[PDB]
Specification:
Two copies of one chain form a homodimer. Chain A is built from no helices and 16 strands. By secondary structure, the first copy, chain A, is mostly beta strands. The structure holds calcium ion (CA) (6 copies). One calcium ion binds near residues 12, 104 and 144 of chain B. One calcium ion (CA) binds near residues 68, 69, 70 and 104 of chain B. It is classed as cell adhesion.
Chain lengths: ~220, ~220
């Protein structure tokens, strides 16, 4: 909290009265003169200009707005101490502000409708097709992008509403029960879901369309 | 980053390889003798013992496990430097670790079923009752507990599904339309929802049972 300082952390999407005092930095030299503090770098004087500011006479670094981990995850500013006589009394101290994640992004399926086909007579347990979703949040150090899949519904609900099932982790849709009848119900429209936080958080849905078929090249 | 240090921040529910290097503290008498570091306090040697540790020979403060802002939001540890011949070279420095929030708690209705009554003939716009929900997350500096109410459904849906409406912020259910026939349908079972992140995040539901009647005491 002088001219020596470790990496600071600020959470994205914070609210409250802005600007907020992040940490303060000072120069011992101020007892022998008057010192003026300044910061430079992207987020400071270079674009995005203005996110961060430092009160000249006190060394108070502040954030002037809510951050967004997905736009810019880390900033690298430099502090400068200049004396009343326009003399650099300190060498530029690099300051690194890391933006910590928040779960503000719903998972997203790689397609709006995935399509597949299953052979009529396929033994229960046979793999049909796979669905996919991605989440913009931090998968390195949070569960804010830990996706778990589920089947919200089947259409038509015949013979019964549980013909297929999807592996909660992998997203692979398998045939759960027997009774696929191509001549009465040739196409299933399942509504899969993907929820982050291992199935607990924010969710999203996309459809999977399965075609029941007599495997052997039919006419 | 010598012996003076700003308050550290660690987000709750972090994942990854543990223990994670938090920040490195250093003493200045380590040039004359070998200095060993130790930390003390709740979270260190006092319950919850072991959350934080410090590498004796290096001064590397680490987190040995995922934190939970809802259990303990702030820790207060102290660092101690002792020279090879068992003598404190530096005073015990106070270290403050703050645990930042994460939206990992669903809102909750104060009741499992709220009950009310509306007089038959009540002018549209009249206030019927109020519903309530709370969220355990940080309302001081995040939206992780910003609740927004909505009516998911009405039962019976007669005369129609929009008999009532709830104020998204306050949670007050008012009569939206006219046509309250207590004779045939004297009871309405509404399913309200509360979702944090101002209606965008995690949600929960509870029912509201409205009983239409003849205002002036009927028997
Ligand atoms: Ca964001
Ligand atoms: Ca995020
Ligand atoms: Ca997410
Ligand atoms: Ca928690
Ligand atoms: Ca929380
Ligand atoms: Ca919450």
């Amino acid at each position: 909290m002088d001219w020596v300082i470790p990496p600071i952390s600020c959470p994205e999407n914070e609210k409250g009265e802005f600007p907020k005092n992040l940490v303060q930095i000072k120069s011992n030299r101020d007892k022998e003169t008057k010192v003026f503090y300044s910061i430079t770098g992207q987020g400071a004087d270079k674009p995005p200009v203005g996110v961060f500011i430092i009160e000249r006479e006190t060394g108070w670094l502040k954030v002037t707005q809510p951050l967004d981990r997905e736009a810019i995850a880390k900033y690298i500013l430099y502090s400068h101490a200049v004396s009343s006589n326009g003399e650099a009394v300190e060498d530029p101290m690099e300051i690194v502000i890391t933006v910590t994640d928040q779960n503000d992004n719903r998972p997203e399926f790689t397609q709006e409708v995935f399509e597949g086909s299953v052979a009529e007579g396929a033994v229960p347990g046979t793999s049909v097709m796979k669905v996919s979703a991605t989440d913009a949040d931090d998968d390195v150090n949070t569960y804010n992008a830990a996706i778990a899949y589920t089947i919200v519904s089947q259409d038509p609900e015949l013979p019964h509403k549980n013909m297929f099932t999807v592996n909660r982790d992998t997203g692979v849709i398998s045939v759960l029960t027997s009774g696929l009848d191509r001549e009465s119900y040739p196409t299933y429209t399942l509504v899969v879901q993907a929820a982050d936080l291992q199935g607990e958080g924010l969710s999203t849905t996309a459809k999977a369309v399965i075609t029941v078929k007599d495997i052997n090249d039919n006419a």
